[PDB]
């Protein structure tokens, strides 16, 4: 049928989201294939920097292609005939200190980036370059779908100087910044929620000073914890984080813009940062506009974070970005700032002028194209699934079995032809770009002096349903992203922050799904090879005497045993080197 009906809404959404064996093996191939990916990048990363000189330092644009084209290597070999949709979920995005995410440069642009920032520099000298300097917090985000099922990898690798005084290649010294306080806060919190999602399968071995038997896991439980880990480490939980439930051809990030009925998850926005500061005075007055936008199934898609309660037979994503705080006297709001392609906006030496390297196709928007180049891109972008891509993936030569300079040239000549079909699509809004954002801290005392004539609440943002419209909530009434930039753009009070982003996928299985085990926790992108911390020393950590903290140490070593009723598997990577 052309009509999408209630018969099939049931056949598509609940069915393919049934946990069955045919389904799990698709996820299992993704767990390794993705970890087989990070293990490859990780390899290439240190080969260039940590050890001896291999005759070129790879660049970030360099490592992106090799990474991606490797993740094509592994989808050639699996479900080749069996499955129609197999591809890259999120493109390799290598990020640096102040960058939240969204950074996926094509090869073409290292002379473009270089050019634009030629004048304004010295903060970002790593990003523009592509060469990575020491003492950086570097995310690597990968994801892959097989048959529309997504496994995502995110990890924060710190790079070190190189000490050859020890023949053993020792990364001299620990990481002594408040920087490292972030990555060990996320590394801690990652294990934190890892052990929490085990207790919703059965209320067995669940921390007593916390939940009881009344709630295996609640909307409030997980949220109370992570902000505890934060306030513990004084690391601001980023406004971009979430804990998500996933489906076939439905994942959290795929479309942040397009709406989802029957929404399941924990959400974190700036509308939540006032509630924590505003828990001092308990005033319940909500000043509300009656607008009927995102009205359809508002109940399900409003993203209630209290009503989420963990189930078994669900696939979850844990997404955590924790912004460190260099000491900030007056309390402030943690926000994200967006990076543009136009130099003129700014005379500030600290700005980044760059280009978005990720894209998305909205099947909602239909516009007839007059150009013949932007048409060949359109019917091609539709020859791929519902997930974000860059213009390189679309081509004949992109996997490029034998990598030559002749092939590096084959793609560059194509990128330009696809640049031109990209203009005509991006202006007609048939496709949305991925926001490239920075970590931005703001003083509370700018926003409370705020004087505004009111204005546009109009929908320009990738932000999700409810929270975005006013951004800073109603109790701050009068503020939208626009007046927020204005505030954020009085700059003596502005500052930016390092970030540690961590992505784990967790598949809850009962004893019907996992036989040999009894009820289990499957960690995809959790492999012992991928989750390695880096040398870190921070004086904050581990606040005792809070009933929620003492319950995490109880639960921290609880998942540490094989008498633990829920056995936590870690998918091991694949074998890389073959020749």
């Amino acid at each position: 049928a052309l009509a999408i009906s209630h018969e099939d809404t049931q056949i598509l959404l609940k069915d393919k989201n049934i946990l069955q064996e045919s389904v799990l093996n698709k996820y299992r191939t993704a767990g390794q294939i993705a970890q087989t990916a990070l293990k490859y990048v990780t390899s290439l990363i240190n080969d260039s920097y940590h050890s001896k000189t291999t005759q070129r330092q790879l660049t970030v644009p360099e490592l992106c292609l090799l990474t991606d084209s490797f993740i094509l290597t592994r989808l050639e070999q699996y479900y080749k005939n069996k499955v129609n949709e197999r591809g890259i979920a999120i493109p390799t995005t290598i990020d640096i200190d102040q960058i939240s995410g969204g950074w996926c440069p094509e090869i073409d642009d290292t002379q473009n980036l270089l050019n634009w920032n030629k004048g304004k520099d010295s903060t970002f000298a790593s990003s523009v370059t592509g060469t990575l300097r020491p003492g950086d917090l570097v995310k690597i985000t990968l994801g892959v779908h097989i048959d529309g099922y997504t496994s995502e990898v995110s990890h924060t690798m710190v790079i070190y100087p190189v000490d050859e005084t020890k023949p053993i290649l020792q990364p001299t010294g620990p990481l002594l910044g408040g920087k490292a306080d972030a990555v060990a806060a996320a590394h801690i919190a990652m294990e934190t929620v890892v052990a929490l999602l085990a207790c919703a399968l059965t209320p067995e071995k669940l921390p007593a000073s916390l939940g009881g038997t009344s709630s295996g896991i609640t909307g409030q439980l997980i949220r109370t914890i992570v902000d505890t880990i934060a306030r513990s480490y004084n690391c601001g939980v980023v406004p971009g984080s979430r804990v998500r439930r996933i489906r076939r051809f439905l994942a959290g990030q795929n479309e942040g813009i397009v709406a989802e009925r029957e929404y399941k998850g924990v959400v974190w926005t700036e509308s939540h940062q006032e509630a924590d500061l505003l828990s001092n005075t308990d005033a319940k007055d909500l000043t509300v506009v009656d607008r009927g936008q995102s009205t359809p199934f508002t109940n399900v898609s409003a993203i209630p974070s209290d009503d989420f309660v963990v189930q078994s037979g669900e696939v979850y994503l844990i997404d955590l970005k924790m912004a460190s705080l260099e000491h900030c006297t007056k309390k402030g709001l943690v926000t994200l700032e967006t990076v543009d392609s136009y130099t003129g906006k700014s005379h500030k030496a600290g700005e980044l002028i760059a280009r978005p390297g990720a894209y998305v196709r909205d099947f909602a928007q239909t516009h007839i194209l007059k150009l013949k180049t932007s048409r060949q891109l359109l019917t091609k972008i539709d020859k791929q699934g519902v997930y974000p891509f860059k213009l390189s993936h679309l081509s004949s030569n992109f996997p490029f079995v034998h990598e030559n300079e002749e092939e590096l040239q084959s793609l560059k000549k194509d990128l330009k032809s696809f640049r031109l079909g990209m203009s005509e699509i991006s202006n007609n809004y048939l496709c949305v770009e991925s926001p490239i954002q920075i970590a931005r801290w703001v003083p509370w005392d700018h926003i409370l002096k705020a004087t505004n004539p009111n204005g546009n609440l109009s929908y320009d943002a990738t932000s999700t349903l409810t929270l975005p419209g006013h951004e800073l909530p109603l109790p701050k009434l009068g503020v939208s992203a626009i007046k927020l930039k204005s505030l954020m753009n009085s700059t003596k009070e502005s500052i930016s922050l390092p970030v540690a982003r961590e992505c784990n996928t967790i598949v809850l299985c009962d004893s019907s799904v996992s036989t040999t085990d009894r009820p289990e926790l499957l960690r995809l992108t959790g492999g012992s090879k991928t989750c390695q911390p880096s040398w870190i020393h921070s004086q904050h950590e581990l606040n005792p005497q809070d009933s929620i903290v003492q319950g995490i140490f109880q639960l921290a070593t609880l998942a540490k045993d094989k008498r633990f009723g829920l056995l936590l598997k870690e998918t091991q990577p694949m074998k890389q080197k073959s020749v």
């Binding site: 397009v258 709406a259 989802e260 009927g292 936008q293 359809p296 199934f297 399900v300 349903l465």
Partner: protein
Amino acid sequence: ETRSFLPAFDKKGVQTQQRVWQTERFDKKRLDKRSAKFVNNQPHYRDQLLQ
């Protein structure tokens, strides 16, 4: 997909462009009533029947 979009509307635009057509119409009628009198001024007219 639950996102339901008909709406695009701005009162500021409609209302404030409303006065505009309403002001200038007031000025066009006013250029009419100034000249209404002698609009029919016809020097060097030839009566057909009069002597």
